[PDB]
Amino acid sequence: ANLYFPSSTTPLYQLSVPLYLSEPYYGSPLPTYIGLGTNGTSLWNSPNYVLFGVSAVQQYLGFIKSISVTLSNGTTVVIPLTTSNMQTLFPQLVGQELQACNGTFQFGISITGLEKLLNLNVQQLNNSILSVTYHDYVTGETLTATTKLVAL
Amino acid sequence: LTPPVSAGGIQAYLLTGSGAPASGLVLFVVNVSNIQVSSSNVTNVISTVVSNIQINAKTENAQTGATTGSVTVRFPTSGYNAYYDSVDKVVFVVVSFLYPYTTTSVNIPLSYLSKYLPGLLTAQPYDETGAQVTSVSSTPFGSLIDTSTGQQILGTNPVLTSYNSYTTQANTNMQEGVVSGTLTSFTLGGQSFSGSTVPVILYAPFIFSNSPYQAGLYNPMQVNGNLGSLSSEAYYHPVIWGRALINTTLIDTYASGSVPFTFQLNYSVPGPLTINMAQLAWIASINNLPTSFTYLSYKFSNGYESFLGIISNSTQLTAGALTINPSGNFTINGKKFYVYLLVVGSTNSTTPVEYVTKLVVEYPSSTNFLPQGVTVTTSSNKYTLPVYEIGGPAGTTITLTGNWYSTPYTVQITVGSTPTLTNYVSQILLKAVAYEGINVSTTQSPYYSTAILSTPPSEISITGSSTITAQGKLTATSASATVNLLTNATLTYENIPLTQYSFNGIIVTPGYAAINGTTAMAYVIGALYNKTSDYVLSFAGSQEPMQVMNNNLTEVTTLAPFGLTLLAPSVPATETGTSPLQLEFFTVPSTSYIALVDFGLWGNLTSVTVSAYDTVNNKLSVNLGYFYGIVIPPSISTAPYNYQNFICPNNYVTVTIYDPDAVLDPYPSGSFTTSSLPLKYGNMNITGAVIFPGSSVYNPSGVFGYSNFNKGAAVTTFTYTAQSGPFSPVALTGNTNYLSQYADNNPTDNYYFIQTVNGMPVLMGGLSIVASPVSASLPSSTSSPGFMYLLPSAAQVPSPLPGMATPNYNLNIYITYKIDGATVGNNMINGLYVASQNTLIYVVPNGSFVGSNIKLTYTTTDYAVLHYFYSTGQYKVFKTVSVPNVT
Amino acid sequence: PSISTAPYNYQNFICPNNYVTVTIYDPDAVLDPYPSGSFTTSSLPLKYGN
């Protein structure tokens, strides 16, 4: 599977980067979504799935692994993970997929919120390694989406 | 409109509603606009078409949209029915599925089938043998021929009996029979035909339609947008603006006629919300309170005041000549305590100055250390505790003496010259949940297709999470404690003796100057110290979302009380514990949207979950649709103008203004009203807004979603009519006091819909026009809102719902001098005027003709768009049209 | 008896219309070679020859 972003050079005219999570064997005929919270926990919810007379319920089938940032003069900066920040950066209860018989879940972190947290410019200048992740309990994998922001 | 159709595709329409002839009739249509069909060969072409159409029957669940089992059949080549409409130019066939008509043919009236196909009213649809028949004959379901067998289906096949007993069958065995259609690709007349139906069939489960849609919820005017640098998420990101409407199509056919539908919206924001919040009240024991401090009440936005709650074993408080009587009292294990509520103000008042209508004090159990909550009663056995005032001029000090058990204690409050209030600024987990309702009855069955507000004016409850912790020192005979709630709020408990209690707590209101003192959280934590086998210090705390009205602090509801324990087998010990804490604010509807802006729960950041509720027959949509709030700044687009567009009264100037955010009614020649009601959702009733289609404002009553609900006569009737006098504009007529309960295609009266307090609109959006040299302006003080019938541009082809709305506004303008100075009775013709539905007319005298011009200023009909683009200068867009300097 | 297996697509696991077909070779387990059929038996003194 994979986790990525619309572009690696997104300019600061849009202040929200949607996280694209493409999981092959994680979806169902639409609708199907994922609640996120606590630790980015992928509470995969699809009460719209039935397999011969039984409805579906919540499956705690993953969680966003981390949001780490490289800053290397020799330092692989593993961020000390804070629960409140991590749940509130991914609070979306419903990340719906796109294609049937294929998980194309849509999540997202906005730039204005991260900048306000970091007390930086709104859309003038902002840039780190900004490497978010996601762990899927689909096949037990760690997918990563890295991004760097261009001034304009 | 919806469902969308492809070139030569197949689609369906159920015949049901108020006045339906028979439930179970489905009209399958195939688009035959790709070829021309005459009456001399219509039989051949329809025979081929029905030969190429296949009908699928499927078994599924009554909650899902996931295919579980599918079978296909085909129309017969002998004994079948086929029809062709040359005005709607499609080939259609009617099939009877549900009870009673399953295998028996029934006659379909022309007038009722005309609802789903208007063309049958003008040209009588063709039948077999080239004969135009005035009534439709349904093709029996049992007469269909199996594709994989070559034989007509049996009379005992499971799906047929399922259709014949659908109600009981789906109720008992929870299996759902869903039909669909498909067209095998074929070439005729040099053109190809193929497609499949978006599920629009007899009755699909009550969910948000997601097939083959990649989002489910969507708005056509979003598709037709000028996305300058957001082109990487065009169809990937279902965005909506401010208070604008986003379309949905609920499939629901468990009732006949009009169906009310309830909606629940969950807003989330990527960011930890730093909230500043005022202390509406402080409640603590006389010993727990400090011996002396400076305090002054904080005035609120509804007349409420900050007050202090002193809990004492003494029957009264004494401050010398001043005595304080029981505001309330309670008993635990036979011991009596008195709670006195005092407002620190400019004088000492014996009379009740405000009230708390419901307050629950919590205390740990003596034997089980479990939370127990009791409502404090007055000395006259009343649950509405009065709150008085104490104080005086600035600098005055009052020493209140009470008793905690047998120990006298004193608290010295200094009346400061400025409000000496404790304000808490903390980062909190926050999200919001809001409710809405709309009666839907459209000719698109089973699609009940409507548009929901991004933020309705209803009771919006902001929920949130934080942590509560308790630290304590425990000895053999006594134990002291501190507790931290709401991430920076602190409460203290002096050394609590054996078998004794100590109470503390806080009521907190949002610190923003729009909901302060109107909604609150009440936490009253009692603590008990005891020894059974180990020294136990227990804490029990209540959680009360709380609201102020009529200066009465009334509880909306109460949450589950929380409990913490500190156990110590050793005589000296230090113990700690933790628990989650819940924050809740049921904001007043009038400020609810504003509160959503105040807490930062809306803008370019927010994401919205949507859930639907069948208010009539009690189904909740297990599907939760999704979209996102974002703000796109309005833009302007102009082109050079020909003088010909100014000379003759058939040539006019079209101005294109970009502002997606002002749309609050994406349907031309449409209108609706709204009314506040207690809406039923889930298992509870919450204040909300029910939207009624039409142009009449009613006064409904009863409980929404039950037999008690019954809307009365139209209190007012809004009508867009031509107005006499100068010109002939189409303007609104009715009681303008209900403009806040009325919404139309015109964005110059839709700002009344949500942001209106005291009968005046807080918001002012839509189109605006000024004209020079003769200074003229609209909206004018002499014209009520809604003085034109401006219709938004229809949605184009790529939109899944053509003819709904378009962010581009094409305004038609005439600039002239000729009819200026004319007389209409006693009226004078000069300046700016409205004509037709979309025409603006500017007339100038002879001297002002040179350079006579109109400046158009379009403002968003959204609060968020005004707020978020004030700095960039792109929240209002202005352009000009002028008389050219011609040779 | 023998067994026969093939690689399986994940698509046959996602939607409730795509399933996995497994082919098992065992001629010997057939005691009713007629689909949608059934029969019963009973002990009796059968007449044969004389």
Residue numbers in the entry:
A (entry chain A): 888 to 1039
B (entry chain D): 1 to 887
C (entry chain A): 634 to 683
Authors' own words:
Surface layers (S-layers) are resilient two-dimensional protein lattices that encapsulate many bacteria and most archaea. In archaea, S-layers usually form the only structural component of the cell wall and thus act as the final frontier between the cell and its environment. Sulfolobus acidocaldarius is a hyperthermophilic and acidophilic Crenarchaeon and thrives in acidic thermal soils and hot springs worldwide. The Sulfolobales S-layer lattice stands out from others because it is a two-component lattice, consisting of the S-layer-forming SlaA and the membrane anchor SlaB.
To address this knowledge gap, we performed cryoET and subtomogram averaging (STA) on S. acidocaldarius exosomes with improved imaging conditions and processing techniques. Exosomes are naturally secreted S-layer-encapsulated vesicles, with a diameter of about 90–230 nm. To analyse the in situ structure of the S-layer, we performed STA using Warp, Relion 3.1, and M and obtained a cryoEM map at 11.2 Å resolution. We fitted our structure of SlaA into the S-layer map, which provided an atomic model of the assembled lattice. SlaA assembles into a sheet with a thickness of 95 Å. The long axes of the SlaA subunits are inclined by an angle of about ~28° with respect to the curved S-layer surface. As a result of this inclination, effectively two zones in the SlaA assembly can be distinguished: an outer zone consisting of D1, D2, D3, and D4, and an inner zone formed by D5 and D6. Six SlaA monomers assemble around a hexagonal pore of 48 Å in diameter (glycans not included). The D1 domains of these six monomers project into and define the shape of the hexagonal pore, together with the domains D3 and D4. The D3 domain of each monomer overlaps with the D4 domain of the following monomer along the hexagonal ring in a clockwise fashion. The triangular pores that surround the hexagonal pores have a diameter of ~85 Å and are defined by the D2, D4, D5, and D6 domains of three SlaA molecules.
